[PDB]
Ligand binder design. Structure first.
Ligand SMILES: *[C@@H]1O[C@H](CO)[C@@H](O[C@@H]2O[C@H](CO)[C@@H](O)[C@H](O)[C@H]2NC(C)=O)[C@H](O)[C@H]1NC(C)=O
Ligand SMILES: *[C@@H]1O[C@H](CO)[C@@H](O[C@@H]2O[C@H](CO)[C@@H](O)[C@H](O)[C@H]2NC(C)=O)[C@H](O)[C@H]1NC(C)=O
Ligand SMILES: *[C@@H]1O[C@H](CO)[C@@H](O[C@@H]2O[C@H](CO)[C@@H](O)[C@H](O)[C@H]2NC(C)=O)[C@H](O)[C@H]1NC(C)=O
Ligand SMILES: *[C@@H]1O[C@H](CO)[C@@H](O)[C@H](O)[C@H]1NC(C)=O
Ligand SMILES: *[C@@H]1O[C@H](CO)[C@@H](O)[C@H](O)[C@H]1NC(C)=O
Ligand SMILES: *[C@@H]1O[C@H](CO)[C@@H](O)[C@H](O)[C@H]1NC(C)=O
Ligand SMILES: *[C@@H]1O[C@H](CO)[C@@H](O)[C@H](O)[C@H]1NC(C)=O
Lengths: 281, 248, 232, 49, 49
């Protein structure tokens, strides 16, 4: 009731947080659901001498994710219990709309389109094509003639398999390579922990517990001290929501960049210099 | 000729427009009529610009309604402070009201700054799309229109801009037998453009986007290796167009 | 929404809290003017342990404490476990379930049938925290919708892949389903063959982008003080 | 060495200077620092008929 | 504009110590000397806030 005298702060805080929360699902949808149909893996696995078997989903898993996906899911340390005390103070965590099984199915569809059809799966219907001319026109997309990879198909195949094995060894051996996602989880965890720990701040009042002020003091001075506590806690909550809005702008920029990376380098072959890694893409 | 330029960037030779020119123009005009009907019917299409108007109206209408907020004071009417109090608590109530209204104004300015950063990002994206699709042809996939880009037309709008992306989608599929190269008498033939297609009895070249068979000659193929170097190579006699000219 | 017309979608409303069932006071076995009660475990009650009041679901915990340690705290220093004065084994304290309440309905332009979402809370306690269409989801309980195995495009999102749609069911009702991600298409890879289309079409799409917003400016004294000289 | 060649950008694959891989523009006076070559034509000895 | 924004933000942060914020004086030690500690901490509380 004394928070009602401050008026419409809480409604706009809830509106800003809901506008962040819907935007998270919009980011996930616009990054991953760029393909109309869920393409599936063909039984013929001779991919021009390549080895796509561990970026393709592992059929022995209960949730059929790929092997490198399982490595990335195992490397990230997660606040599971850290979720208890933040739950008890009015802070909730909403589940994402697209579960990781459907993200795995979407990535499997994008892989099956990219492998069995080149970059035509993003425009219309996916259509079969072999890899000698596929990687040859992609080699023609970087300025060398198509005949070189017809000569060196097996060497390039074993080079790509060795690079895949090196990435597998690095992502099995290093949990700290996933710095930015661990930074996201750590930033959210420290923001929630700082928000819960700022209830203990007295904010210059006689106590940080509302019952200690309310149950003993006279009504005017208790209203003064509760106004001090409400001002401090509302300033803390406004600072938290503002920092979440700035972090949401940063995450929106990162998700727009990731969607552009998907639409340009997974669904095509980029001519931009150093947009999709050093060297010709 | 502008259509011959736009087809030339997406893997289509200049002749293919004129061979379907009436059909291409009729499909284009039918699509313009379809988007006229879509804009006349769907009143929920302009979501983002109406959301911009709603954002500005909601921010102003929630800043204006914060004038009635007490912010813990006796009242938000200052003459109650100036007429029913001594000054030693009146300055405290003035401090409370001014601090609350200044905090609400700071909140509104912060929201306007964050939304101005978002709108500036969207306007930089819109200026980039203007300069890449109105002033040119977008070579970047799924930037202007799903599929191969042909044009985009700018249309004015309240607090925004609307593009009409004209795309290029293949429709009717067929399958053919292929080879990376075709070796004729120890000469591996690499095509300068197109992929070798076989209909079962004869070998042809065909562009990767639509069906266009041509007899494999020495004009559309080049040789830099023998039969052994290309993996998956087949045999066909590469016909020479010089041979009727030799008999002239 | 402060409006007489509510459109189609999912909308946040006032939340719900599971109130305590009883009040539990624990005192050593000379106490104060009030006297202790019996212990209640695995249920949402008020608790009191030698003056440490609150509301929580006391558990059958097996936590090992040092003999001087009467209390415990979480990582954020919230009290999670206590030593009961009647029984010196340690009881973990978890305050009761709650969550935001979301109303899933088609628009009042179309209909007025209501499905209610209880975010993050299990259906084993939601309708008594009236039912008749109950679906349990990891994202939260759902009241007023019937689960259908037929997968479609997402009409109104709920969470954890479940979406709710308004369809005739044989009659109009709200039904929840696992979302369809599209169709399924197998492209038979074989290195002997390519596939090239024969006929191509031309299509026109639409893109909408904001460019600017409303320009505003604020006078200081007119807004904050409203033309009072001593306020200025 | 002494054999001038046309070469791709990313892979050293040298081919003899032919009219199939080169095009003609201007005379040999205005351009800067240019050299000699006996430019072959693969189609030219096949015309004896 | 970046340099002027930095200088203007630092300077505007500087002159708001002169702003009394409803307290009796801008200088804290004057409030400590003139009054005893109980009302003094209220005035310093308004200044710090
Ligand atoms: C492609 O690489 C993967 C990863 O090294 C290979 O999978 C391994 O195969 C060996 C032998 O069957 C097993 O002992 C490992 O447990 C497999 N590892 C994983 C992660 O699956 C796969 O055999 C390779 N495929 C080809 C055709 O060489
Ligand atoms: C070009 O680089 C590739 C990549 O290293 C070379 O391929 C390797 O060559 C060494 C030496 O013969 C072998 O031991 C490796 O096994 C090769 N790699 C693979 C994946 O087989 C290649 O020799 C280099 N030179 C040329 C002319 O291609
Ligand atoms: C490509 O497809 C279009 C339709 O998408 C074909 O146009 C139709 O052709 C038939 C027979 O000539 C007419 O009866 C129809 O009126 C045409 N229009 C439509 C909208 O169906 C076109 O003929 C096809 N071209 C090729 C080369 O197959
Ligand atoms: C393949 O094309 C040739 C054209 O040279 C034609 O004579 C032949 O009948 C075609 N075969 C089939 C099976 O369509
Ligand atoms: C083509 O596919 C068949 C069947 O999988 C396989 O046996 C053969 O080795 C492949 N050929 C090439 C050149 O990849
Ligand atoms: C092509 O011809 C060679 C002999 O010149 C032969 O060995 C080879 O088997 C032929 N290719 C096919 C696919 O039959
Ligand atoms: C709901 O509760 C029951 C028992 O209380 C439990 O078995 C079930 O797993 C819970 N549902 C979920 C989604 O966890």
């Amino acid at each position: 009731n004394l928070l009602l005298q401050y008026g419409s702060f809480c409604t706009q805080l809830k509106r800003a947080l809901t506008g962040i929360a819907v935007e998270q699902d919009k980011n996930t949808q616009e990054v991953f659901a760029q393909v109309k149909q869920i393409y599936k893996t063909p039984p013929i696995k001779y991919f021009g001498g390549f080895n796509f078997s561990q970026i393709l989903p592992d059929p022995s898993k209960p949730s059929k994710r790929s092997f490198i996906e399982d490595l990335l899911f195992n490397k990230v340390t997660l606040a599971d219990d850290l979720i208890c005390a933040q739950k008890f103070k009015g802070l909730t965590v909403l589940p994402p709309l697209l579960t990781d099984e459907m993200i795995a199915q979407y990535t499997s569809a994008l892989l099956a389109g990219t492998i069995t059809s080149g970059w035509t799966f993003g425009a219309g219907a996916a259509l079969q094509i072999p890899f000698a001319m596929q990687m040859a026109y992609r080699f023609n997309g970087i300025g060398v003639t198509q005949n070189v990879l017809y000569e060196n198909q097996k060497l390039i195949a074993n080079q790509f398999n060795s690079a895949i094995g090196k990435i597998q060894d690095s992502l099995s051996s290093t949990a700290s390579a996933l710095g930015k996602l661990q930074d996201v989880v750590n930033h959210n965890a420290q923001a929630l922990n700082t928000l819960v720990k700022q209830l203990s701040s007295k904010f210059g009042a006689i106590s940080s517990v509302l019952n200690d002020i309310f149950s003993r003091l006279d009504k005017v001075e208790a209203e003064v001290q509760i106004d001090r506590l409400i001002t401090g806690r509302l300033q803390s909550l406004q600072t938290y929501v503002t920092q979440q809005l700035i972090r949401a702008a940063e995450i929106r920029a990162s998700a727009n960049l990731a969607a552009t990376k998907m639409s340009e380098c997974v669904l095509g072959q980029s001519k931009r210099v150093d947009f999709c890694g050093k060297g010709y893409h | 000729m502008q259509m011959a330029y736009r087809f030339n960037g997406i893997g289509v030779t200049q002749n293919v427009l004129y061979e379907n020119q009436k059909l291409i123009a009729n499909q284009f005009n039918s699509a313009i009529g379809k988007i006229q009907d879509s804009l006349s019917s769907t009143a929920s299409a302009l979501g983002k610009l109406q959301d911009v108007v709603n954002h500005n109206a909601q921010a102003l209408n929630t800043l204006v309604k914060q004038l009635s907020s007490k912010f813990g004071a006796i009242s938000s009417v200052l003459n109650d402070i100036f007429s029913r109090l001594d000054k030693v608590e009146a300055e405290v109530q003035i401090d409370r009201l001014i601090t609350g209204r200044l905090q609400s104004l700071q909140t509104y300015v912060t929201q306007q700054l964050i939304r101005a950063a978002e709108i500036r990002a969207s306007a930089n994206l819109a200026a980039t799309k203007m300069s890449e699709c109105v002033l040119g042809q977008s070579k970047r996939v799924d930037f202007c229109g799903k599929g191969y880009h042909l044009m985009s037309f700018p249309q004015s709008a309240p607090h925004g801009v609307v593009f009409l992306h004209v795309t290029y989608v293949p429709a009717q599929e067929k399958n053919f037998t292929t080879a990376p190269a075709i070796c004729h008498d120890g000469k591996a033939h690499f095509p300068r453009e197109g992929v070798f297609v076989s209909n079962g009895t004869h070998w042809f070249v065909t562009q990767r986007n639509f069906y266009e068979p041509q007899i494999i000659t020495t004009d559309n193929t080049f040789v830099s290796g023998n039969c052994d170097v290309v993996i998956g190579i087949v045999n066909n006699t590469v016909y020479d167009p010089l041979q009727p000219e030799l008999d002239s | 929404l402060k409006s007489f017309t509510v459109e189609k979608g999912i909308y946040q409303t006032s939340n719900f809290r599971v109130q305590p069932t009883e009040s539990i006071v624990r005192f050593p076995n000379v106490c104060g003017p009030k006297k202790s009660t019996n212990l209640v475990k695995n249920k949402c009650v008020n608790f009191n342990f030698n003056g440490l009041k609150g509301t929580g679901v006391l558990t059958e915990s097996n936590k090992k404490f040092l003999p001087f340690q009467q209390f415990g705290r979480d990582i954020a220093d919230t009290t999670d476990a206590v030593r009961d004065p009647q029984t010196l084994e340690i009881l973990d304290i978890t305050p009761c379930s709650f969550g935001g309440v979301s109303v899933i309905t088609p628009g009042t332009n179309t209909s007025n049938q209501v499905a209610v979402l209880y975010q993050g809370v299990n259906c084993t306690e939601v309708p008594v925290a009236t039912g008749s269409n109950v679906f349990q989801t990891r994202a939260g309980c759902l009241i007023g919708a019937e689960y259908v195995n037929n997968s479609y495009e997402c009409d109104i999102p709920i969470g954890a892949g479940i979406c709710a749609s308004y369809q005739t069911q044989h009659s109009q009702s709200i039904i929840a389903y696992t979302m369809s991600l599209g169709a399924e298409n197998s492209v038979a890879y074989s290195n002997n063959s390519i596939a090239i289309p024969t006929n191509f079409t031309i299509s026109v799409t639409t893109e909408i982008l904001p460019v600017s917003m409303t320009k505003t400016s604020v006078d200081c004294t007119m807004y904050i003080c409203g033309d009072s000289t001593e306020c200025s």
